[PDB]
Amino acid sequence: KVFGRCELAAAMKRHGLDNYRGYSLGNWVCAAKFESNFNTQATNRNTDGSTDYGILQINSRWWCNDGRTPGSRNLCNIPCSALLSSDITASVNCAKKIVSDGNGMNAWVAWRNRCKGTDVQAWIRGCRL
Ligand code: NA
Ligand code: NA
Ligand code: NA
Ligand code: NA
Ligand code: NA
Secondary structure, three states, X not given: XXXXXXHHHHHHHHOOOOXXXXXXXHHXXXXXXXXXXXXXXXXXXXXXXXXEXXXXXXXXXXXXXXXXXXXXXXXXXXXXXXXXXXXXXXXXXXHHHHOOOOOHHHHOHHHHHHOOOOOHHHHHOOOOO
């Protein structure tokens, strides 16, 4: 599923990401834009044999099991395929596990480069959220 900006913002809001560990909603929308272009089916293969999955391009080395990232972990206790669903539950829950504290969004390089230190409120503008 390819979400619209405000559509994803609203879903992320419903799922509790607004001000999660102090990160306002726009942060998460901004990260998703530059990680996946709001496409739940986004995948990226890395040279280390890991893969990034879903709206937030969550990586298989640590966070999910894809059965092909040898010697890796699954801290979200999910198959990585769960991160490709139109149902954003698994991606949100896993994102919350990644951000386990208030510097946690540094995990996403795209967030660091495109969102951190920015007025992320623009990401929810026009959404009435
Ligand atoms: Na929802
Ligand atoms: Na893994
Ligand atoms: Na797979
Ligand atoms: Na899917
Ligand atoms: Na930006």
